[PDB]
């Protein structure tokens, strides 16, 4: 049950654009490293890369919800 944690304080987003397809969704699995979600902070859109290959067990934070440091973002395997 690996948990990916947000590395910065910001607002959580799934789509890189307001009207674009979500980076990931529960089910569809991911790889060792790739964009998984967005945390916006002081503009400067930031991309969160997974540190572990695996399947997306779940996602704990909705889009637009502010996240803090060490905020559980997604659960993989």
């Amino acid at each position: 049950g690996h948990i990916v944690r947000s590395p910065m304080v910001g607002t959580f987003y799934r789509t890189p654009s307001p009207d674009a397809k979500a980076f990931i969704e529960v089910g569809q699995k991911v790889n060792v490293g790739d964009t998984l979600c967005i945390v916006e902070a002081m503009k400067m859109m930031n991309q969160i890369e997974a540190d572990k290959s695996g399947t997306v067990k779940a996602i704990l934070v909705e889009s637009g919800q502010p996240v803090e440091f060490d905020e559980p973002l997604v659960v993989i395997e």
Binding site: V9, M42, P66, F69, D70
Partner: protein
């Protein structure tokens, strides 16, 4: 009024700012690290944001993280308290860039007063006396350095321009160790403050650290609230602070205070500050200024009745000064004792769980701390865990109240310096008053 503010600090000052906010009806955001989730003010704050890991360089000295917390929480001001980024001009201008209100002076003011080489020049321009010294930064012109040392008169002290907390200071008695002392001071300054500039000043041997508290709204108004007496120091780190300073007559008090207020007006100061003077032979000698609320400020609050943090919040909100100079009246005498968490016989910090805790009460006893029974003191931050301020109609009553309240205080599970405070209170010369800055080290003798 401020809709909401971020308390970019921790511990006792964070509680003070949160409690002032609660009184004024301001919403509070308490930014903490990942090891500070247990802090009392974090559990008492309206919104809490974990801004980084345990170390200070990653949690509280992280300007982007604090700005991001303010942004996501929709705050309008940031209170730095003291320590960390309170005297950081980069923090001031970077907070003011993003449309947030910095509760404190301007960035330019912090830059000007932030380096003593420029603060001394500004004070001399403003008529505030200063200690005779190098009157400028020290270079490699050793002949000039020794000529200046002879002119001012030995002994001499080398002080880093960006120095703080009592470090980066070396006392030199003769030309033999001048170069080596300068080199080591520069190395320590490089390793600590990222600024190797140093300057030489006369080394007074029997001064009394007397500092003036001043409130200015940045609109042409400035007042001075009595003074303090921080002469009970160890390694240049204060232990017992009291106000008003014994032996400072009302004539001298007004003479220094009005000049300090005029100097505040000169630089267009804002918020609450503090001028630090050395008192000797009835002459004040400026050494530095603190552009922030001071740790020992509660003593000035208990003799004038003026809440300084609420004044800071009001000044930041834009309201002018609501206190006239004639309305400030000193009624009594307050004595404060910093309760650190360290080995009393080795002054080494002692982190660990607090198993028992019982704070003292009584008429005129204030206990300012964030600890509680079952609170694990983290090792990453400074050792101070609380302050104990006792107030009375005169100095003797304040000292007796302090002695009573120090026995009634229980802190188990960690090594704390309460017995040192008890033995300082019982010292006869301290009860007499007017001791010098070097008295405590002589008393300990080691």
């Amino acid at each position: 009024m401020l809709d909401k503010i971020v308390i970019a600090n921790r511990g006792e000052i964070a509680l003070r700012i949160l409690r002032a906010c609660k009184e004024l009806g301001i919403k509070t955001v308490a930014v903490h690290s990942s090891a500070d989730r247990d802090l009392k003010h974090v559990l008492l704050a309206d919104e809490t944001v974990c801004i980084g890991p345990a170390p200070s360089v990653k949690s509280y000295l992280n300007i982007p993280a604090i700005i991001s917390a303010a942004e996501i929480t929709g705050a309008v001001a940031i209170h730095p308290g003291y320590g960390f980024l309170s005297e950081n001009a980069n923090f001031a201008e970077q907070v003011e860039r993003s449309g947030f209100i910095f509760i404190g002076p301007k960035a330019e003011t912090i830059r000007l007063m932030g380096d003593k080489v420029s603060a001394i020049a500004a004070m001399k321009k403003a008529g505030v006396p200063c200690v005779p010294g190098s009157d400028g930064p020290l270079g490699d012109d050793m002949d000039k350095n020794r000529a200046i040392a002879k002119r001012i008169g030995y002994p001499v002290i080398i002080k880093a321009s960006g120095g703080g907390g009592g470090r980066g200071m070396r006392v030199v008695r003769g030309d033999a160790e001048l170069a080596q002392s300068i080199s080591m001071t520069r190395a320590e300054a490089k390793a600590a403050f990222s600024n190797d500039m140093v300057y030489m000043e006369k080394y007074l041997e029997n001064p009394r650290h007397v500092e003036i508290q001043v409130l200015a709204d940045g609109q042409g108004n400035a007042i001075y609230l009595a003074e303090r007496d921080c002469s009970m120091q160890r390694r240049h780190q204060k232990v017992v602070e009291e106000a008003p300073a014994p032996g400072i007559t009302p004539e001298l008090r007004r003479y220094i205070g009005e000049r300090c207020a005029k100097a505040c007006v000169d630089i267009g100061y804002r918020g609450a500050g503090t001028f630090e003077f050395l008192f000797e032979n009835g002459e004040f000698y400026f050494i530095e200024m603190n552009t922030r609320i001071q740790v020992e400020h509660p003593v000035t609050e208990m003799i004038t009745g003026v809440d300084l943090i609420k004044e800071q919040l009001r000044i930041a909100a834009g309201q002018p000064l609501s206190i006239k100079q004639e309305e400030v009246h000193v009624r009594g005498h307050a004595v404060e004792c910093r309760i650190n968490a360290e080995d009393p016989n080795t002054f080494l910090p002692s982190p660990g769980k607090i198993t028992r805790f019982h704070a003292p009460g009584g008429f005129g006893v204030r206990w300012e701390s964030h600890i509680y029974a079952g609170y694990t003191v983290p090792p990453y931050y400074d050792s101070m865990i609380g302050k104990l301020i006792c107030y009375g109609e005169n100095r003797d009553v304040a000292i007796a109240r302090m002695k009573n309240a120090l026995q009634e205080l229980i802190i188990d599970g960690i090594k704390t310096n309460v017995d040192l405070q008890i033995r300082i209170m019982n010292d006869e010369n301290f009860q007499h008053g007017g001791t010098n800055i070097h008295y405590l080290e002589k008393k300990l003798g080691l």
